[PDB]
Design a protein around this nucleic acid. Structure first.
Ligand SMILES: [Mg+2]
Ligand SMILES: [Mg+2]
Ligand SMILES: [Mg+2]
Ligand SMILES: [Mg+2]
Ligand SMILES: [Mg+2]
Ligand SMILES: [Mg+2]
Ligand SMILES: [Mg+2]
Ligand SMILES: [Mg+2]
Ligand SMILES: [Mg+2]
Ligand SMILES: [Mg+2]
Ligand SMILES: [Mg+2]
Ligand SMILES: [Mg+2]
Ligand SMILES: [Mg+2]
Ligand SMILES: [Mg+2]
Ligand SMILES: [Mg+2]
Ligand SMILES: [Mg+2]
Ligand SMILES: [Mg+2]
Ligand SMILES: [Mg+2]
Ligand SMILES: [Mg+2]
Ligand SMILES: [Mg+2]
Length: 48
RNA sequence: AACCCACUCCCGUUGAAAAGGUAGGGGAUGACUUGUGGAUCGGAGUGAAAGGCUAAUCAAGCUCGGAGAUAGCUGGUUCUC
């Protein structure tokens, strides 16, 4: 039990995904928003 | 003639010049031209009226704030399997 020897259980922590970083990441360019439209823009939210 | 203007042609258009020049042209004692100082201004002023002019900016000047106004619209969005 050292400070450089303890970690969390598998699956307890994930990494978050970052849109707009290259092609190989799978979330590049549009970043999961599809193409043009209201719900592809900054503040483009449909009211409840 | 000076002075004030700006009708025509040409040149110039990266100009000598962000509106000129050479030739010609109109008024030239008058509703004339001009120096100095002053007054009126932003939905306001001034206008022998062209929506003209208010510092090369005018169907509502410039500047700083509300303010990162709003943009169902264009553009862009970065390593790997
Ligand atoms: Mg994909
Ligand atoms: Mg998605
Ligand atoms: Mg696009
Ligand atoms: Mg579409
Ligand atoms: Mg869509
Ligand atoms: Mg926005
Ligand atoms: Mg003179
Ligand atoms: Mg001639
Ligand atoms: Mg002349
Ligand atoms: Mg003369
Ligand atoms: Mg006469
Ligand atoms: Mg006088
Ligand atoms: Mg005043
Ligand atoms: Mg105004
Ligand atoms: Mg008219
Ligand atoms: Mg000024
Ligand atoms: Mg002016
Ligand atoms: Mg506000
Ligand atoms: Mg903006
Ligand atoms: Mg296009």
């Amino acid at each position: 039990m050292q400070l450089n020897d303890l970690r969390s259980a598998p699956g307890a922590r994930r990494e978050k995904h970052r849109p707009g970083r290259g092609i190989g990441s799978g979330l590049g360019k549009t970043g999961g928003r599809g193409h043009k439209g209201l719900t592809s823009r900054s503040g483009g939210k449909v009211a409840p």
